[PDB]
Every structure is written in structure tokens, then in C-alpha cells.
Amino acid sequence: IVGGYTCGANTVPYQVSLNSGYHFCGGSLINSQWVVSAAHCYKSGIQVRLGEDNINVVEGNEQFISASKSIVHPSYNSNTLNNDIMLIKLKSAASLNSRVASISLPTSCASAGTQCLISGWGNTKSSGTSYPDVLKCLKAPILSDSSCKSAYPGQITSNMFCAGYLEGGKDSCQGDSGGPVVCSGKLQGIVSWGSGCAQKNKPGVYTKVCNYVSWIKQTIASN
Ligand SMILES: COc1ccc2c(CCN)c[nH]c2c1
Ligand SMILES: [Ca+2]
């Protein structure tokens, strides 16, 4: 997260870290057994880390649970990033508590102008690299689809939305991939792609979760 702030330990209790020997992506806990992340975060050997603040220190509220199954969206296209969503099932159910909590799926699609919370352990610099230990947060509004398409002509599908700032300086970045965009207490977006981080006229692009609620619900009812 570039241009954000330190969330505060466990104040984003649905935020997970995906670990393959090191943190490589975020995700969102949607119930005791399932995490939503980006399809571009798919890899083998995923351990889901819940209850994290400092990802380099065991602080006492973590749960580390291996993935037992990953399900990338059937229509995910890695070249265009259309349908950039994946489900991860936990080998055992997480114990839900004040530091480990699920986030509800949306009932409707959030509207332009709505303020949302984006979080992760990604790079905090728009030029160069610096990776934080504690979870970072950014408040960012959803942008109109006309402004989103103007920023990324020919690239925004109906499964994507832009959030952030056209002036740059505040954005999600490398390593925030797969993490949550939460608006009105619901998971509306997944950190998906952009042109760099926090660049002028290049706001972050996010998977439009509301389009996937039926797929999520049917998949978790059968796996
Ligand atoms: C390889 O560099 C990057 C830089 C930024 C991003 C993002 C978020 C952009 N708002 C998702 N994946 C990335 C990969
Ligand atoms: Ca920790």
C-alpha cells in the first residue's frame, strides 16, 4: 500500500496473508473454511495465515492453516485479468474470534463515490521498493466507470472497477494482490492490477466481487 497508514493490529480481522515460505499475496476470510483471493495469486504450497499484524513476528493471535484445495475461476484469463478471482479452502476450519473474523459478501454492487478500505502488506513505495511488516490500510473511493475506462482504454471489463486517486500517490501495490476492498462492511473488490502503483492517471483496478457471489456460494456449497 502506497500513501496509506498503519491499520492497527487486528483491526482488519478478515485480512489474510498467503505464505509460500514468505508472504506473497493477500486474501479475505469469507467464512471459517474459505478465503477469497485473486486468481493471479494461484500457486501450490499455500499456507493461509490469519490473525496477522506483523508478518515476521509471532504475536500470539495467528492461525496458520494449509490450503487443501484451490479453485481458480473457470473463466479467468491471465492475459487480460478478466475474472481475477480464486477460492481457497482451508484444511481445517479457522477458530473465529475478535482477531479472526469473516467478511460478508456483497448483496449489491457498490457505487461510484463510495469510500472503501483497501489493505495489505505490499510495497509502500511508488518508485523503488520497501515492504512493511505490519498491515497497511488505504481509504479510497470507487471511481466512475467512465473515468476508469479513460484511464485504461480498451482494458476494463464489466468484471473490474477502479478505486483510488487520479492524482497518484495513494494506491495498492505489489504484494497487496488478492487482498480486500471493503465498502459498507462488505467485500466489494480484490486487488487485481494497475499500471505500476500510485502513478498519475493510473488508479488501481479491482475484481468486481458482486459479479461472483453466485459462483462463490454454489462452489462453497459443493466443496
Ligand atoms: C509487478 O508489479 C505490480 C505492481 C502493482 C500491482 C498490483 C496493484 C496495483 N494497484 C497488483 N499486482 C501488481 C504488480
Ligand atoms: Ca505475526
Curated annotation (Swiss-Prot):
Its main location: secreted. Synthesized in the acinar cells of the pancreas. It is an enzyme of class 3 (hydrolase). Keywords: Calcium, Digestion, Disulfide bond, Hydrolase, Metal-binding, Protease, Secreted, Serine protease, Signal, Zymogen. Is inhibited by scorpion cyclotide trypsin inhibitor TopI1. It comes from the Eukaryota. One of its GO terms (biological process) is proteolysis. Its EC number is 3.4.21.4. It holds the Pfam family Trypsin. Substrate binds at D171, S172, Q174, G175, S177. GO terms for cellular component: extracellular space; serine protease inhibitor complex. Binds 1 Ca(2+) ion per subunit. Subsequent cleavage after Lys-125 leads to alpha-trypsin. Further cleavage after Lys-170 yields pseudotrypsin. A cleavage may also occur after Arg-99. Not sulfated on tyrosine residue(s). It catalyses: Preferential cleavage: Arg-|-Xaa, Lys-|-Xaa. The active site is at H40 (charge relay system), D84 (charge relay system), S177 (charge relay system). Residues 1-221 form the Peptidase S1 domain. GO terms for molecular function: endopeptidase activity; metal ion binding; serine-type endopeptidase activity; serpin family protein binding. Ca(2+) binds at E52, N54, V57, E62. Disulfide bonds join C7-C137, C25-C41, C109-C210, C116-C183, C148-C162, C173-C197. Interacts with SERPINA1. PANTHER family: RIKEN CDNA 2210010C04 GENE (PTHR24264:SF15), TRYPSIN-RELATED (PTHR24264). Belongs to the peptidase S1 family. This is Serine protease 1. It comes from Bos taurus (Bovine). The lineage of its organism: Eukaryota, Metazoa, Chordata, Craniata, Vertebrata.
